């Protein structure tokens, strides 16, 4: 079984890679993009207005080998805002990344 410490270490590496991406990725094509962010779970890039944004299941997951084709989703509204839950948190679908 994968230990808590092993998962914590890989999560820290994932967070560090995310912060490199947030700093290094080129600016969006326009200001109407939803803005990149790290929500403690997934690393989100800039979002195209009016489109779903898909990110691979975070590779630090203990069961990541069981969901290799899965994606976590956000929705970027036409006004450049991440879709919000009715909670003031962004809408998120993690179903493809849940443990089998």
């Amino acid at each position: 079984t994968v230990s808590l410490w092993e998962t914590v270490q890989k999560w820290r590496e994932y967070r560090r890679q995310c912060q490199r991406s947030l700093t290094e990725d080129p600016p969006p094509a326009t200001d109407l993009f939803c803005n990149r962010t790290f929500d403690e779970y997934a690393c989100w890039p800039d979002g195209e207005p009016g489109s779903f944004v898909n990110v691979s299941c975070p590779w630090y997951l203990p069961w990541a080998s069981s969901v290799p084709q899965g994606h976590v989703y956000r929705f970027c509204t036409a006004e450049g805002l991440w879709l919000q839950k009715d909670s003031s948190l962004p809408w998120r679908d993690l179903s493809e990344c849940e443990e089998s």
């Binding site: 079984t1 994968v2 230990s3 808590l4 092993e6 998962t7 914590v8 999560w11 403690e40 779970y41 997951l61 203990p62 993690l94 443990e99």
Partner: peptide, 27 residues
Amino acid sequence: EGXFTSDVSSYLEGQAAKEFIAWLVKG
């Protein structure tokens, strides 16, 4: 199957990592 003490102790150890993920997700 799943009838031995090591099965339960291993289950416990794996729950620590899983609760960490749930903590990341829910907040």
